[PDB]
Amino acid sequence: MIVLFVDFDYFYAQVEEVLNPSLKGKPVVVCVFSGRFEDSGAVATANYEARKFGVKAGIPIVEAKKILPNAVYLPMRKEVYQQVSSRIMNLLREYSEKIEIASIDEAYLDISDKVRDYREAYNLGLEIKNKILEKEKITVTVGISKNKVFAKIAADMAKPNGIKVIDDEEVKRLIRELDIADVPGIGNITAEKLKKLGINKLVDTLSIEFDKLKGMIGEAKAKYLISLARDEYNEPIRTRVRKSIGRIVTMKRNSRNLEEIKPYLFRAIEESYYKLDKRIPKAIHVVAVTEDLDIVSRGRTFPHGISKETAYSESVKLLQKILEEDERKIRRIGVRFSKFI
DNA sequence: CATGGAATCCTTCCCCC
DNA sequence: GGGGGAAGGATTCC
Ligand SMILES: Nc1ncnc2c1ncn2[C@H]1C[C@H](O)[C@@H](COP(=O)(O)OP(=O)(O)OP(=O)(O)O)O1
Ligand SMILES: [Ca+2]
Numbered sequence: 033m034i035v036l037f038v039d040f041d042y043f044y045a046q047v048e049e050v051l052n053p054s055l056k057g058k059p060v061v062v063c064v065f066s067g068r069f070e071d072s073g074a075v076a077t078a079n080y081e082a083r084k085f086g087v088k089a090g091i092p093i094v095e096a097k098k099i100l101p102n103a104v105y106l107p108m109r110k111e112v113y114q115q116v117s118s119r120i121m122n123l124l125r126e127y128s129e130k131i132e133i134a135s136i137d138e139a140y141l142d143i144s145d146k147v148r149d150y151r152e153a154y155n156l157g158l159e160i161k162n163k164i165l166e167k168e169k170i171t172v173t174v175g176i177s178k179n180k181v182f183a184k185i186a187a188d189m190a191k192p193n194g195i196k197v198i199d200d201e202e203v204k205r206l207i208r209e210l211d212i213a214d215v216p217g218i219g220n221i222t223a224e225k226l227k228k229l230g231i232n233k234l235v236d237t238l239s240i241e242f243d244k245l246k247g248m249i250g251e252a253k254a255k256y257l258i259s260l261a262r263d264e265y266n267e268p269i270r271t272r273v274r275k276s277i278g279r280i281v282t283m284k285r286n287s288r289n290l291e292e293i294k295p296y297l298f299r300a301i302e303e304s305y306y307k308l309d310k311r312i313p314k315a316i317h318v319v320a321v322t323e324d325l326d327i328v329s330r331g332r333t334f335p336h337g338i339s340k341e342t343a344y345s346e347s348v349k350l351l352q353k354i355l356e357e358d359e360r361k362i363r364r365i366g367v368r369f370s371k372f373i
Numbered sequence: 374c375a376t377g378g379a380a381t382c383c384t385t386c387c388c389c390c
Numbered sequence: 391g392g393g394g395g396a397a398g399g400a401t402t403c404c
């Protein structure tokens with residue numbers, strides 16, 4: 033079984049670069065301005081000219097300018113990146129019907145057919161990296177291996193602009209050498225709970241009584257880990273589908289004032305509805321980020337679709353329930369529509 | 374200082390054979 | 391006791 037994982041390099045920055053080659057060579061930072069103040073916002077992503085100096089997704093736009101005051105800073109243009117991504121996803125389809133679009137820049141292909149071994153796999157890897165670099169002019173990294181997890185790990189290793197294969201001989205040394213935290217799906221919270229269990233490697237998951245592990249990180253997660261370690265993880269490449277559509281915005285000022293909030297909320301709803309395009313939700317949730325960056329939410333499922341008129345009205349009772357229930361001031365507000373017909 | 378989007382799992386009810 | 395869902399939160403990663 034051979035899985036090939038494709039991963040567009042510093043994607044947003046690269047796209048901004050492809051749309052204005054004059055940028056190539058310079059440090060480019062794609063930002064998300066929250067407009068609360070001068071350069072308030074976070075970094076969506078940066079190309080390597082910037083990443084090599086610490087500028088990476090998540091850090092404040094202000095902190096980055098301290099590091100590279102002369103780098104190019106650009107506002108995020110989601111739609112544009114999204115279309116470029118789709119086009120690229122097709123070039124990839126033409127390499128296997130078995131494709132799993134994970135994110136806006138990640139995908140897996142089941143090429144157990146086409147290829148007969150890790151060699152022809154590699155070639156197909158160079159062939160693909162090439163077609164994309166030609167058709168759209170964008171570099172991607174290719175991870176190749178037995179299952180999705182290791183194909184992705186190969187990618188993390190071989191990037192940027194690389195391609196790497198992780199054969200069975202190596203998978204086994206990794207299940208031993210590779211640090212557990214460096215395993216897809218293990219954030220810091222998990223990584224932390226894992227230390228406390230003396231589990232710092234995939235292998236240690238076999239020296240613990242499953243039931244204790246299930247009580248620490250959860251059944252799903254514990255089974256996930258245990259099967260990888262046992263060299264038995266074998267998840268299929270399935271095609272995913274949008275299960276929720278939403279929009280969250282930041283308010284110039286933290287508020288509790290219903291009226292002060294509504295405008296931001298209706299705007300979120302409006303945008304959301306435009307995005308739903310043809311899709312009809314039976315579920316709605318109102319989401320809020322408290323002034324201490326905590327998240328609060330209240331929803332409701334209807335026994336039928338939801339009209340914009342109903343959503344408008346219904347989202348207000350939920351924002352009210354929120355303010356009634358919680359007392360902190362609200363920083364960001366938004367809606368999320370799920371359970372399409 | 375810290376945008377914003379979305380999927381998945383875990384707990385806690387809760388109604389009911 | 392446990393099936394079946396809805397809710398609200400926890401956690402991960404793009
Ligand atoms: N906090 C964020 N806000 C908005 N967009 C984000 C955020 N974090 C990540 N993204 C986007 C950034 C990228 O354009 C896209 C993710 O690709 P990642 O960021 O996974 O790879 P990258 O392409 O920047 O790194 P690499 O050099 O491995 O290719 O997801
Ligand atoms: Ca990635």
Ligand SMILES: [Ca+2]
Nearest residue numbers: 039040041042
């Ligand atoms: Ca990437």
Ligand SMILES: [Ca+2]
Nearest residue numbers: 213214218219
């Ligand atoms: Ca990790």
